[PDB]
């Protein structure tokens, strides 16, 4: 079981009927452990809205992690996506609540259009997890963008994802659940060794003020199943509607206009039944796993806008930080991927020590690594840039 789970099992969560309405603000779903305890005193029927959440809060470590992700869309107008790398911790506002801390957003190979997004295969996918594991990190979810300008004088964006439309398209529900399937969460009471997923979906769109806001979703554990056996399709005309194919028979329970229980063929399936709302947070005490440079090293895969990771930008970057503490200079997830996977002087052989120095924020350890032979020749290479 995950480190957070071994801990939440060992912690009291009180202060079974009126529980849902005391530890307020208004919570939409019970936390996974509490709904577990609210019961101690899944393959291919029907679709009911899920009363529990595997993750209760998504928290970006600081505004900069999210800001820099968004520059891709600002500079291009193209939708962009990334993977959330980080860790799972306790959400102390909610008893037994699970928090997803986002330390870094990794931007993999993709094709972004104004109205479309394609997820190419990442030849570095595996090695990036390997680097991320050694930095105390794992994928906690994915984030994608859906920003369209509205007022080009104000600099604002359409509030297109709202109560009268959708929050998640059916296409993104199927994608979300797929991701949840490939990132299962580990628990005993499930006939496989795993129940659910802790993989979250972040959405950058216009909010009601036509500024950018960040919203968090997971998809129901039922929804997980229908896509796992490919029983769920999206709809061409309307983003708010799924569709069940024909293989088993499912449907949902609405309520009509004199207020009684109902049941109708999922033809279509209103996305609202599949969606699990997670709250989204920027903390007042910000967190700096990675360092914030005034002039950061470039984010990866930014060909299409003329930001490139190469030994010219590293020469530049390194020369702007001669007076900076070396650990602060090097504590950057995107620098580190480049340092490990570049095709000129890769450092995959002698990384471990440095990545340990970044993960534990150890200065003396990083300083000795700066005296490594492979860093000296890295510096010999940079100094030949003019």
């Amino acid at each position: 079981e995950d480190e957070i789970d071994q801990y939440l099992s060992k912690q009291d969560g009180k202060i079974d009927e009126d529980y849902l309405n005391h530890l307020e603000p208004p919570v939409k779903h019970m936390s996974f452990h509490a709904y577990i305890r609210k019961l101690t005193g899944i393959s291919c029927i029907t679709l009911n809205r899920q009363k529990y959440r595997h993750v209760d809060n998504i928290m970006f470590e600081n505004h900069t992690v999210a800001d820099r992700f968004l520059d891709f869309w600002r500079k291009t107008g193209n939708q962009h996506f990334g993977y959330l790398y980080g860790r799972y911790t306790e959400h102390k506002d909610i008893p037994l609540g699970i928090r997803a801390e986002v330390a870094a957003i990794y931007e993999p190979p993709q094709i972004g259009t104004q109205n479309s997004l394609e997820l190419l295969e990442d030849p570095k996918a595996e090695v990036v997890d390997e680097i991320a594991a050694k930095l105390g990190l794992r994928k906690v979810g994915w984030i994608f963008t859906d920003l369209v300008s509205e007022d080009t004088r104000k600099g604002t964006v359409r509030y297109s994802r709202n109560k009268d439309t959708y929050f998640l398209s059916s296409e993104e529900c199927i994608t979300a659940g797929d991701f949840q399937n490939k990132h299962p969460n580990m628990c005993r009471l499930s006939p496989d060794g795993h129940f659910g997923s802790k993989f979250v979906t972040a959405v950058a769109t216009g909010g009601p003020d036509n500024q950018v806001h960040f919203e968090g979703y997971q998809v129901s554990n039922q929804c997980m199943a229908l896509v796992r056996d490919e029983c769920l399709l999206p709809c061409k005309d309307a983003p708010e509607l799924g569709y069940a194919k024909e293989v088993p028979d499912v449907f949902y329970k609405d309520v009509d206009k004199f207020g009684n229980e109902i049941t109708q063929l999922a033809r279509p399936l209103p996305v609202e039944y599949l969606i699990i709302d997670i709250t989204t947070t920027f903390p007042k005490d910000p967190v700096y796993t990675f360092s914030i440079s005034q002039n950061p090293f470039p984010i990866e895969n930014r060909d299409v806008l003329g930001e490139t990771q190469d030994f010219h930008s590293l020469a530049t970057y390194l020369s702007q930080n001669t007076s900076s503490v070396f650990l602060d200079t090097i504590s950057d997830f995107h620098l580190l991927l480049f340092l490990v996977t570049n095709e000129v002087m890769p450092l995959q052989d002698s990384i471990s020590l440095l990545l340990e120095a970044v993960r534990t924020r150890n200065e003396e350890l990083a300083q000795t690594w700066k005296r490594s032979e492979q860093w000296a020749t890295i510096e010999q290479l940079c100094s030949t840039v003019g």
């Binding site: 479309s116 997004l117 399709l233 061409k236 309307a238 569709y243």
Partner: peptide, 16 residues
């Protein structure tokens, strides 16, 4: 209403 339009790995943002 109409459905078929899907291959995984590719999201489309329906505008109108």
């Amino acid at each position: 209403i109409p459905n078929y339009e899907f291959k995984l790995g590719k999201i489309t943002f329906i505008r109108n």
